[PDB]
């Protein structure tokens, strides 16, 4: 019986962890789309062509 309950603890931990992961990338998506309509694009592409 103890082994069974330990497995449940692991399952709950992972379930909640998955929710936070996907919501985190969704939030980064929403932050970025609104905030990038600038010459910040030039910053990124300059570093890319320097690395290229």
């Amino acid at each position: 019986a103890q082994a069974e309950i330990e497995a449940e603890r692991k399952r709950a931990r992972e379930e909640l962890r998955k929710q936070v992961a996907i919501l985190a990338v969704a939030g980064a998506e929403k932050i970025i789309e609104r905030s990038v309509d600038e010459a910040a694009n030039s910053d990124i592409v300059d570093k890319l062509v320097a690395e290229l």
């Binding site: 497995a7 603890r9 692991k10 399952r11 931990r13 992972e14 909640l16 962890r17 936070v20 985190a24």
Partner: protein, 512 residues
């Protein structure tokens, strides 16, 4: 204690681990799709056996490098794909995670976890396609693998590093015998691996639940490919399972691996190959079907300490590792002479043949002597087991043949009568319950009682009672000898005298 803060810290750590700078990659396009087979245009830098990443998290294996295309197979549901999707090339040859942190997990053939436990911890990757250690690197097998059952430890002994095929018809106890072998290694320091190819899913969950119920699960890795999943996943399932077992072998440890149905893997290779139009041979399998089971099973081996030292760069000295394999083959109507059963019989170190006529007669486990053999020899067995077992195997085979002719006519000459009585009592003594393993001390007492004649004056209907009472008697009073025989399997005249006294006193003094 479930704790939110530690999860948040881990997510932040993943953000820190991510590197934003990109890397140049060779790319290609899907051109055609059918039955899990793929034809790709591009990928000038690809290599045969490479892993190609498709849209989503799915992957594909490059099989043919044609002049102007690549032939590949999807490792999952292929129906969601369409011509023109971009595919990137990971130079990684087909690989899967390995490490001792895998014990107690249920895992897909691609290394992804199938249980709800979470992400997986591994000690790097090992390649799925590899060539086994050569002739000079091998070592002779010299240590036992004590499974629970009386019959296969006494008549068909298995040594660490041996390959032994469990063969029989459907619903004959193959699965039960294999997992009871796993369960009895729970305390013997041998790591276990179970590879399920093509089984119905409910079965697999029930098997894992029974492994947990006896506490063996913490010592096992379980690899799963259900009957619902794409044929390529099934075909590659045993190779992934083999790749994990080699980790323990090369570090000087001992491991045990079960392949639940190699016949179903052979069917999978039929489907992939015939979908690639390769001309068939006998029973419609390709001639490559020998090479398949050959290179898979030949990885199971015992390696000498010089190989272990050279492999581990000298971190382990003097130890010798091993991988023990119990493949399972389902055969139609008990025909041992069909193609694939004959191929695997040509590869293993022996076979354990389970007969449906014995099983239906209630003689379980239904091991058939004469057909079952262990070609490794008695070198696997301990001293007391080797001395007490002796000719019991051939005596049983001869008893069965004599029963065959005795059914036909009446010719009883008193030695035939006693031979028949002895054989019938021995067969009644060999049968055993499911999930009921018994230690070498108990097995040696049983064999001693059988062959030193003590079962004289004992009824056949009393044989099971006689054993239950005897093992309780020896558990109660002469326990220290049991501890001694279980520690060192030593057969001396001192120990024979003690056993003789125990059986004399039990037969004279006790009841059953």
């Amino acid at each position: 204690q479930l704790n939110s803060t530690e999860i948040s810290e881990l997510i932040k750590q993943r953000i820190a681990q991510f590197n934003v700078v990109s890397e140049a990659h060779n790319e290609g396009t899907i051109v055609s799709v059918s039955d899990g087979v793929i034809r790709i245009h591009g990928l000038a830098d690809a290599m045969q056996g490479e892993m190609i990443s498709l849209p989503g998290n799915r992957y594909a294996i490059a099989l043919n490098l044609e002049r102007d295309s690549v032939g590949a197979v999807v490792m999952g549901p292929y129906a969601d794909l369409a011509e023109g999707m971009k595919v990137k090339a990971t130079g990684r040859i087909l690989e899967v995670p390995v490490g001792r942190g895998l014990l107690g997990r249920v895992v897909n053939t691609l290394g992804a976890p199938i249980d709800g436990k979470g992400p997986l911890d591994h000690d790097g990757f090992s390649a799925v396609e590899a060539i086994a250690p050569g002739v000079i690197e091998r070592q002779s097998v010299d240590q036992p693998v004590q499974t629970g059952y009386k019959a296969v430890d006494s008549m068909i002994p298995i040594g660490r590093g041996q390959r032994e095929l469990i063969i029989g018809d459907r619903q004959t106890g193959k699965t039960a015998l294999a997992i009871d072998a796993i369960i009895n290694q729970r305390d013997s320091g041998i790591k276990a691996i179970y590879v399920a190819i093509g089984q119905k899913a409910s079965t697999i969950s029930n098997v894992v639940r029974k492994l947990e119920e006896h506490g063996a699960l913490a010592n096992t890795i379980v690899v799963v490919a259900t009957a619902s999943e794409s044929a390529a996943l099934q075909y590659l399932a045993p190779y992934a399972g083999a790749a994990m077992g080699e980790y323990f072998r090369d570090r000087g440890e001992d491991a045990l691996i079960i392949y639940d149905d190699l016949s179903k893997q052979a069917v999978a290779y039929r489907q992939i190959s015939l979908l690639l139009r390769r001309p068939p041979g006998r029973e419609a399998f390709p001639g490559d079907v020998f090479y398949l089971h050959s290179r898979l099973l030949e990885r199971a081996a015992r390696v000498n300490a010089e190989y272990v030292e050279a492999f581990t760069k000298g971190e382990v000295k003097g130890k010798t590792g091993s991988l023990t394999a119990l493949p399972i083959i389902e055969t139609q109507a008990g025909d041992v002479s069909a193609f694939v059963p004959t191929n695997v019989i040509s590869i293993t170190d022996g076979q354990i043949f389970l007969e449906t006529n014995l099983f239906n007669a209630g003689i379980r486990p239904a091991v058939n002597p004469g057909i079952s053999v262990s070609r490794v020899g008695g070198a696997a067995q301990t001293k007391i087991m080797k001395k007490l077992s002796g000719g019991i195997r051939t005596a049983l085979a001869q008893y069965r043949e004599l029963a065959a002719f005795s059914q036909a006519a009446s010719d009883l000459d008193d030695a035939t009568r006693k031979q028949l009585d002895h054989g019938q009592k021995v067969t009644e003594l060999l049968k055993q319950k499911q999930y009921a393993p018994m230690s070498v001390a108990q097995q040696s007492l049983v064999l001693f009682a059988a062959e030193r004649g003590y079962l004289a004056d004992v009824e056949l209907s009393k044989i099971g009672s006689f054993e239950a009472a005897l093992l309780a008697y020896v558990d109660r009073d002469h326990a220290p000898l049991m501890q001694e025989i279980n520690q060192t399997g030593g057969y001396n005249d001192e120990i024979e005298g003690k056993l003789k006294g125990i059986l004399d006193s039990f037969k004279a003094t006790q009841s059953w």
